[PDB]
Design a protein around this ligand. Structure first.
Ligand SMILES: [Fe+3]
Ligand SMILES: [Fe+3]
Ligand SMILES: [Fe+3]
Ligand SMILES: [Fe+3]
Lengths: 198, 198, 197, 197
């Protein structure tokens, strides 16, 4: 157990009712934990046992034979990132640098929000919707399964988990309502704005 | 419109307590319905409007720009196939032709069930676990997302939906328990046996 | 599907300013290769049914399709480039374009100084442009295959500053090449037509 | 402050694979220009007292001081490139480096194909590298002045694929140039020392 499950940055009930404590209990305590334990078991006694998580993600991103390692390693990263993407009483619009860059790039926050929700809702199957910056330009991305921006040469600013386990207890099939609530009440814009200046 | 949602072959509560009436209500009445409505809207005013569902699947399986149409068309097919793969008082073992072919190929039913379970459990993200016949040989197949045996040249005999919406309300993360319940109490072996002789 | 357009003049008609040897490789190899690359990348795709300009607009947003964008835009850029030049070019525009340059830069010499600055400060491969964007003349420079239309601007004039455009004749002396482009090759009638197009 | 280092051999020592004419322009004009540009850009700045490598790392975290990064990285890249070649080079590596290439790529030939592919699929100006990061070998391609050290990797070998590197001798035929680099010029002794550096 050289990799460990990080604490949630808030109480399991902090996102109620938008994301339920039951969801967070299974999502963090079961899914996120299993990705960690799988990763630990898959790299034991291998050359990857002495690498960081980010090093493992990049080292196994190409080799389809190592897809089991990439899939668990990237999911550990993605879920830690996702918990920090949210906060109780979040949502709204960002300010300052990120707000201005979004207006410069998309024309408005509403334009950004519509593009983000479309990527989130058109990602078929399991995956992730992202706001990224790449060579200094903001882009929306959607990725399948465990894929994530860093292996495409982009820096993630924000993500929304659209694996069905992230919303099914609370929203069932209503993924659009889930993403709309994410945008309206949960997104931590201070987080994305700090990462933009990183 | 062009394509219709077929009735379940049993009451929404007929698989209780193994699959809840709640799950079947969302799984059939929302997810399966949505794939039908999407398909109908996507092929309207196109050459695909005049073809059978199977023809649409093969016509869109090759070209990535038509993946939206493929994804919904194949999901209509997969779910319809899946409902018929189950029945109240299912489970047990197959008889006759299919039992003998499983014993010749896997050595035993228990070996087949171990291999079907592991494919279902190691399918990362959304997808399907299949028993197929291919080039005269019985094989286990796992497919991601909407993918399915026929566009690979195999004949499907049985499937288990391992999209998270298939089990999350009743089993949450415990996909192995759900698959174990599928084999133990739900699988309709009469269906797979007839298809083997189709 | 897509074809290389002929040069609008003799392969040797820009000598000594741009050599026939340069044009042979620039038109017959580089521009040809972008056309053949584009055809192979769009075959059996919905892009096969679109125009060059529609391909450029359909792929500018999706980095996954940068190979198609780069070949499509380079086809467009080079065709534009051949038509920006002519034997016995150079001099200055007259009429509408001259007056807009004089009102915007103050002077033709001011425009040529700014155009040449953008051309020589483009690091690596790219293009220097005179564009009109919401009714205003601007100098633009673009890296690699980038071009004005995906930035909401209308190209009036371009000079290729990929090294293959000048290395056989000028080697490292990109500033001399651009000065020779403005002095002897630019076709101001083309740019003036585009301003009213 | 910074100066242009000697070529490690006579300008004709790589004939007929790379012409003396190419080396005179590539080393005496391009490499020299990166050095003179760097000196002029850092004068009276905080960066004037730092080493080339210190300047590269400090400015790499930035798009706003990009003339300094681009010229400093190009100074570094070219010095490294000249030492990646030798007269009567080519062949294959032996010992430590050969073993790692076999374990990593399966064979030298797989390595050379992957290296070739990176060199030819780099669109525009750029570089193809063999790098090592955390004991793992891989191939890298970078655009313009970008280089492995700012990505956390150690360069072992590079091939310049800016068009000035080959256009006088190969024109558009980058694949043949890279083939010739691998076949006749690569200095494997250099890369094997760096693996253990
Ligand atoms: Fe998740
Ligand atoms: Fe389903
Ligand atoms: Fe060109
Ligand atoms: Fe160079």
């Amino acid at each position: 157990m050289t990799h460990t499950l990080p604490n949630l940055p808030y109480d399991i009930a902090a996102l109620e009712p938008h994301i339920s404590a039951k969801t967070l209990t299974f999502h963090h305590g079961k899914h996120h934990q299993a990705y960690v334990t799988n990763l630990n078991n898959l790299i034991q006694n291998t050359e990857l046992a002495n690498k960081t998580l980010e090093e493992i993600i990049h080292a196994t991103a190409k080799n389809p034979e190592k897809a089991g390692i990439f899939n668990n390693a990237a999911q550990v990263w993605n879920h830690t990132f996702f918990w920090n993407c949210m906060k109780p009483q979040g949502g709204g619009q960002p300010t300052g640098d990120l707000k201005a860059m979004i207006d410069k790039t998309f024309g408005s926050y509403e334009a950004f929000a519509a593009d983000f929700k479309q990527a989130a809702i058109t990602q078929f199957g399991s995956g992730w919707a992202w706001l990224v910056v790449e060579r200094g330009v903001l882009r929306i991305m959607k990725t399948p399964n465990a894929d994530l921006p860093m292996v495409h040469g982009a820096t993630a600013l924000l993500t929304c988990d659209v694996w069905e386990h992230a919303y099914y207890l609370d929203y069932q099939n209503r993924r659009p309502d889930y993403v709309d609530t994410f945008l309206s009440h949960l997104v931590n814009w201070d987080f994305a704005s700090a990462l933009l200046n990183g």
